[PDB]
From Swiss-Prot, chains A, B, C, D, E, F:
Bilayer topology: Peripheral membrane protein
UniProt entry tagged with the keyword Phosphoprotein: no
Name recorded for this polypeptide: Bifunctional nitrilase/nitrile hydratase NIT4
Thermal profile of function: Optimum temperature for both activities is 40 degrees Celsius.
Regulation: Both catalytic activities are inhibited by N-ethylmaleimide and are up-regulated during senescence.
Family matches, as SUPFAM superfamilies: Carbon-nitrogen hydrolase
Gene (UniProt): NIT4
Signal peptide extent: none
GO MF, one example: 3-cyanoalanine hydratase activity
Activity at various pH: Optimum pH is 7-9 for both activities.
CDD domains according to UniProt: nitrilases_CHs (cd07564)
Keywords: Acetylation, Cell membrane, Hydrolase, Lyase, Membrane
Active-site residue list: E42 (proton acceptor), K129 (proton donor), C163 (nucleophile)
GO BP annotations, alphabetical order: cyanide metabolic process; detoxification of nitrogen compound
Length: 289, 289, 289, 289, 289, 289
């Protein structure tokens, strides 16, 4: 039986060493009451460009999109480097698990990834985004299949997903076949229908849906946490930014998979069959002796 | 641009020629205002045994389960026969499309199927249930893959699903790959979470979710109809049995698939790949010349 | 709800018009109490050669097998002919159904067949024996697949089998796939294990096992009748020859197929699959215009 | 010429390391007289939930079925793991063959399997149950075709079956086509008709039917052992729990298949033909390089 | 039980009313001892041209083949006409069956046919020759399939064949499928191997092989009669011309078909299958109203 | 132009490695004079049970048939295995062709087959028996159509047949249509009529009839060899066992098919037509991926 927290804070949107101390003070203030798992929202370190259109008509490419793009590119990180050693030391000083929504660069590209840290300051892995939604295709990149993780912990098996990857059926039935029961899902939209889109995943799974959205200035995000029977523990606080916590009874899953039970004993293997191609494909591959 | 109706009535649970005239009078009363598509709930003709347990401990099989089962078996139909000719003549007299939730027999078995009729009194086909949920396994049967239909009409493409087949991800992404935009879904549960489980399918698709539940005596079912942007047109009437109608603008789908667009241009074919085995398999196959 | 009788009498073994009047007097004496279905044993008209070996070493063929074989061949019938018109007139005078174990000839061969008559004196068909057992191969013939009948009556569906065709699994699961619920089985062995070999078919089916054996002078045959729950109604009378009757409640089948239910909803079609080749194959086929 | 034993003991129904030492002391007490093959009943390690109904009406799902199901799920094993290494070491210390009825888990499911061990402590394979009977469908799982084993030993060829798979004709004529002559069949019912249902398999085969049922507190099971001529060697001891042994003359099979001889020289291939589809089908299949 | 005679006489080779009285005096001399079936040799009325080659090199066609052919053509008969009325009156005056080897004409062709008469002077039918052997192709004609007869009599079923049609396997297994047990076979060769070629047909059938050859001046023909067990009753008289008789026990066939039994219960219909096309085909067919 | 030998020896009837060295010493003693083709009799390796009746009345089945059958079953071979590798090495050491009459087992059945070996120790194929004759049906098995071979060699085309398959007309006209001109025919009867039954096949074919029978202690078999004009080269030696040889002029076939010529230019295709169904049919057919 564990207990987990989510946050709802926002970034200062520029100069990423300034927003990295907010993470320190909030994670300590969440650590003061014996918390054990902390989830941060989407694009909390790199920043999420809202409202701007970069002046893209069809391919006119005016001069006030280029300077805007290079000022946005100059505020991203790269893993592993000097910017994740501070977060590893942050999560290492005491006992807490840590997922984190950052934005990485790799040679003048931008991938909207997410990170995973354990209680001993190790770097488990990362999960890049499969496909950006509508206009984020112009600036971000596509992820491959050799990134979806397993990540078993001594408090259960934790996974992740980003904003509009929760709507795919195939990716969720690829997550369910590995045994996820703590299903973190950061996002960056604020609508009323998001709660009704999460309750379906909570019923279809057996997993504690544990989301997080950010609040800034008005695009008022609402985060929550849902039991695997459709029971909202801590409600959708639309009012301000705060810390949101609840307890997680891990004996409430084997009593919840008595009814439905996805990729076991439903999902008839004699008629349906899925297979995922998971190859680490890269364009140019050097080889020496 | 069409308009469609659902019903919420119940059966008399015994003596199926008596409940077949309720269908006549309700379908005419729904036809008086120029309706064009009528959806009936799950197990409306055969009857839905609620509350009874048939006295099944682990395999004790007391004598008061056998007489109950034969009295229930004596009130089912068989297709095609004298019981569907009356429904074909019912839908043939004027212009209406008709889906219908019945229970068929085939040599001392019970399949929970669903029927499809056009405006000219033809019998298009049927869709048996893939797997019953928990205790219905003791009395009902399993369906195969060679039953999931396409059924294009001159008002669009219509499909169906039953109570807990809407929770599978693989069956819904097999329905979406054929091009369903009017997604009928009869059911026989009455909970609050069913509306939030339908809104996710309405967003993930692009289809007019058009459900129907029954109301009897208290297991108060609530039926509804949902636009493909998450807009409930006619609300979940939990109060009594009535007729529920709305209009369906078929120009609200190509403007709804500008954002998401499942099995096209999302659902990356380079990493995921699904294939459905659809063979009409039967146990004993006679062959002559 | 019907009632059926079996007999246990023997033949006079020679001169077949003499044994054809015993059939008349026994069938009238069974008809005096409102009986409706009468079953006669195996080889009741032609005769069953017991004890004789025809002096066959390996192919020595002494002279005292040939005269014995021609004296046995001179006491068989041929269908349809003057010998079945008398049985049709016998069953036509009042209302009774009739199965009958005879031996037919067809050009110096001997087939151990069985006959079927309705209440109006019609000749429905016949069912030849698939393969004789051990030493009967020397004198009898092999049957083909285009003989296994359906024979629906207005009191149910009746079929048949002979002595050691009840031990094949494939022939019984070919009988079950047509819907037999009154499973007549004449035989010509008298052992203790035959009752335990019939109770398994009564459980595996759902059919009223209705057997008949003959008693002569000591090879004391015992006939019986078994409910589809394993309930012997009229016992195995090993003592003398008599008439044996019981009643048949046809509402005791849909309550018996609640548990097991062969070729429906057991017998998984996704893994097993049987197919029967049923062609009327004959050696020399004349064709004209 | 070998000799084999069966047991009739029961489990302590909870806390599976406690019931695993009863197996040790009984298997040594059976090993003291030079035994060579030991058969344990159905669900001897995981436990067989008798009498409880889990409060399932039609889908009401009250709270006192969930805690009962999770307390039952917390007492199952998983293969291969730390619980079968002790049984391999148990059968390895001296010379004995071992079949064993356990219950395995695989990600919050329950399969009612059976195990096979040789005299050298190797793990040959397993045979999951094809379909549970009536109410066990609510908790257990369905097996596929790629599990039915051959398992030739230097004392003959051994196979298995579970409670109501012995009533299928197709599965038994799929077992017979591989050459089974020691046909183990654990079960968990106690009726009088089970002996008469086993004698038919003993005649139809040529195999030593070697069953085992459990006795607890009254559901008094009776185990036995049957020669391939219909000769009960050690009787159906309905009184208490004990050890039951006999000798097995393996020269009593080629003299028993002189009469009948299934899938050889009976079972006419020109008319009947069976084919079994045996594919290891699984829902989600990962593939890498 | 009948008795039959064959003859061995020769023709006067020219002027066919002269050789027609030899038939009268020989048939009366054979009728004096209560005979019942008389067989005459091949080409007894028309004449058999022996030794002459007609001077045919490859197509030189010298003048001394034409006059020889017209002198041979001027000594043939035509059926039905004034030449068969005398034979019908010959066989009508008392009780005898009659087969007869003649040569018919039909518009400047020559067919080597055979005739059949009963005890009442009726004309049953005829059997033309299928194909002449080597050099007879130059003068004779080919027969069709619509000529092979059945001809049941009140002393059995009689058929026929000519010189080298007894060597075909297909024609003999087309004769056997109609039920021939008195198998007449006229011929016109005189070799030692003919007796060994007839004994095989007598064993393969079950029929009384009853042949006849002619003796003239030295081409000494030898006729015989063979039981269906390989027992020559009246021997091959190579010395002169005479009358040859024996008795025919018709109870020696059902004791002879206990061993072999062609087109019944041998001749596996599941692998072999023969079909004979029997259409009365003619070149020019007039049709009127 | 080749030369061929037959043998007439007998088996020691028990313990088949003892009778396998007689084959070695006789085949070398036949190889000393430049022989090229060696034919062994019917059932030379497995043994031919003569005189015994196994005590079969009609189905009494006394105890002294079972032990006799298992002692006979324990002396048969199985192909391909360790018993044919020695014969392949036997025929491989020098140049000789080899046909051989053995008895094979396949899972407690007995098939009376025949084998074929070339000069290089290869295993060409086998020809099982189509149907056993009268009493051999009780112990042996039926062959299918997918076994009749072609087997062209660089000395001609060789085929085979067994005891009473030479009497069928359809099987011989199926052998003739493949082009057999060396027609081996082992047998196990000793009568006078067998020579007259072989001379007909020698005339009807064009093939060197090359038979072989065994001699033991009195059932004195007589083997021979026949030219395709009806000329016995080496006579029917009824006296003792010996080696019998002759020469085979292969230019004596195209001069023998000038007269008759079966399935060419006789056997009128416009009226007769045969077709053979040749499918490898088996009862239970496993299929995997």
């Amino acid at each position: 039986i564990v207990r987990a927290t989510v946050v709802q804070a926002s970034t200062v949107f520029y100069d990423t060493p300034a927003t990295l101390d907010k993470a320190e003070r909030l994670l300590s203030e969440a650590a003061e009451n014996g918390s054990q798992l902390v989830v941060f929202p989407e694009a909390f370190i790199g920043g999420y460009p809202r409202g701007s259109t970069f002046e893209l008509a069809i391919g006119s490419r005016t001069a006030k999109g280029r300077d805007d793009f290079r000022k946005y590119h100059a505020s991203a990180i790269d893993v592993p480097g000097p910017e994740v050693e501070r977060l590893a030391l942050m999560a290492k000083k005491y006992k807490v698990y840590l997922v984190m929504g950052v934005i990485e660069r790799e040679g003048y590209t931008l991938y909207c990834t997410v990170l995973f840290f354990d209680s001993q300051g190790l770097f488990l892995g990362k999960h890049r985004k499969l496909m950006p939604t509508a206009l984020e295709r112009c600036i971000w990149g596509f992820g491959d299949g050799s990134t979806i993780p397993v990540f078993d912990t001594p408090i259960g098996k934790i996974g992740a997903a980003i904003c509009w990857e929760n709507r795919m059926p195939s990716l969720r039935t690829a997550m369910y076949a590995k045994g996820i029961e703590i299903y973190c899902a950061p996002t960056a939209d604020s609508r009323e229908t998001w709660l009704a889109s999460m309750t379906h995943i909570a019923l279809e799974g057996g997993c504690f849906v544990l989301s997080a959205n950010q609040f800034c200035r008005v695009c008022a995000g609402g985060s929550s946490i849902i039991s695997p029977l459709g029971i909202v523990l801590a409600g959708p606080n639309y009012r301000g930014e705060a810390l949101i916590t609840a307890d997680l009874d891990l004996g409430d899953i084997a009593r919840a998979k008595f009814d439905f039970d996805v990729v076991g004993h439903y999902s008839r293997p004699e008629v349906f069959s899925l297979n995922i191609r998971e190859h680490p494909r890269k364009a140019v591959s050097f080889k020496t002796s």
